[PDB]
Amino acid sequence: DEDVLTTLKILIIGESGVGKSSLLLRFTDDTFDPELAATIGVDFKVKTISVDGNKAKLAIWDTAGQERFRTLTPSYYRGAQGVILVYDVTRRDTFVKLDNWLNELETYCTRNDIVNMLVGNKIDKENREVDRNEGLKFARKHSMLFIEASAKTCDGVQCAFEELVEKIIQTPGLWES
């Protein structure tokens, strides 16, 4: 790790079934599992990437969307530097519930510079319920980055993680050791 600038804690949150774990598997393993199992507790994965000429090691916390499967919730948020909030563009309920997730995240307000990225997933699917502009409006109202993605067809996945990391490195007090 002699060329690694820093290790960043990235949290992935959002309702069950929106594709959190699939976005992560696409990013770490370059594959998709149509039958991926629901996450129980937290699934931690490490991946190192390069953005703007710097290598950042990502410690990624993929959490269960079902509240009954979450434990030590304060631990999930503690130290997070980037947060990816995910909704399913085919399920309006998962988009409206992002307000509950944001309320939770805002109780872990030690710093006010954590970088948030909103991802509307499953854009490959039929029967979209949330349009892109609606997701963009929410992101901008909350000063978040925004991307639409498909873990299934790869659209937007790499950018969701790269754009988040680029911005975290450009917010110095956030990662300086």
Residues that bind Mg ion (CB under 5 A): 20-21, 39
Give the E-state strand segments of 14-123 in sequence order: 42-51, 54-63, 82-88, 115-121
Strand partners, 13: 85
Q: Work out which of 4, 29, 30, 38 binds ligand GNP, going by CB under 6 A.
A: 38
Site residues (CB under 6 A) for ligand GNP, limited to 148-167: 150-152
Closest approach, Cβ 56 to ligand GNP, in A, equals 23
**Is residue 7 at the binding interface for ligand GNP, with CB under 6 A as the rule?**
no
On whether 65 is known to bind a ligand per the annotation, the reply is yes
Residue number, 69 or 175, with CB nearest to ligand GNP: 69
**Is residue 20 at the binding interface for ligand GNP, with CB under 6 A as the rule?**
yes
Rounded to whole angstroms, the Cα distance separating 55 from 14 reads 27
What pairing do the DSSP bridges indicate for beta strands 82-88 and 42-51? Answer: unpaired
Q: With contact defined as beta carbons under 8 Å apart, do 134 and 160 qualify?
A: no
Total number of residues shown for the chain: 177
On whether 122 is known to bind a ligand per the annotation, the reply is yes
User: Which partner in ligand GNP, Mg ion, none is near 26 (CB below 5 to 8 A by kind)?
Assistant: none
End-to-end CA distance of the chain: 16
Rounded to whole angstroms, the Cα distance separating 121 from 88 reads 5
User: Which partner in Mg ion, ligand GNP, none is near 81 (CB below 5 to 8 A by kind)?
Assistant: none
52: left (phi over 0), alpha (psi -120 to 50) or beta: left
Site residues (CB under 6 A) for ligand GNP, limited to 80-119: none
Residue number, 41 or 50, with CB nearest to ligand GNP: 41
Binding site for ligand GNP (CB under 6 A): 16-22, 33-36, 38-39, 64-66, 121-122, 124-125, 150-152
Binding residues for Mg(2+): 21, 39
